[PDB]
Design a protein around this ligand. Sequence first.
Ligand SMILES: CCOC(=O)c1c(-c2ccccc2)oc2ccc(O)c(CN3CCOCC3)c12
Length: 272
Amino acid sequence: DGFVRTLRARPEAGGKVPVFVFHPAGGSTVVYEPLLGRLPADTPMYGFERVEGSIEERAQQYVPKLIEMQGDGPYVLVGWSLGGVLAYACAIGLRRLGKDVRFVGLIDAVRAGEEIPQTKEEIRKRWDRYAAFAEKTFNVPAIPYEQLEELDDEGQVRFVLDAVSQSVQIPAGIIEHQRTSYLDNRAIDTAQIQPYDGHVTLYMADRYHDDAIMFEPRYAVRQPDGGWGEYVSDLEVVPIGGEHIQAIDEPIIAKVGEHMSRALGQIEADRT
Ligand SMILES: CCOC(=O)c1c(-c2ccccc2)oc2ccc(O)c(CN3CCOCC3)c12
């Protein structure tokens, strides 16, 4: 257990190369079950669930466990949403330690069409935007920008949540789910992408959904390479259409699965 979920266990010895999937923003790796059904028979799959920190800090926890599980390789890393960024971060980490990474699968992990500033001004604009939505959906003051600007994202939400309780009474499970979903989404926004010299496959939908765009309008635009071209020279794009939220489910996941199954077979053949 821990932060590793077994979706399909590998046999005691040998077997096919396992697929490592990484959780999405505000979700668990159970979302990869439809993908699992579209991969070849007896393909093992292990899901890495949420841990805390920057993307690099999260990868620092994941990579040692990956090596514990798969040693030298070969590594197949896959992720939808935040999971894609996490898969990529692990690939960089693993390659840096001399491991054999043969497949990185990004399921619509698309960068915003315009870069997202990590500035104090952007912090002010973000919470101004959030406040306005809050006014409308809850039918309800000055924003203490100076205190917010000094905090990181976790500090920011903690500050806002604390201030809210001072009336206001929100059940813990709803708060915590909104909190982790928010922070996971911000982790995508603030990811500092490093270059990777291996093969990356990007399954690309048409667009982000409306709710995502409301939160950060810069996601209203996608570049053809999904923003990965400058960091990845060996990049393949597999268009799948539909929306970001649909990309992980049937029927669209069948397209992803058919393509990905072809990649896995070549890996199994090259081993033999
Ligand atoms: C329902 C869609 O909500 C979100 O995507 C976001 C959420 C959120 C909040 C509560 C519950 C669920 C999600 O918080 C965000 C913070 C920044 C940000 O750019 C985004 C927009 N994202 C950023 C990453 O790329 C996809 C869109 C979000």
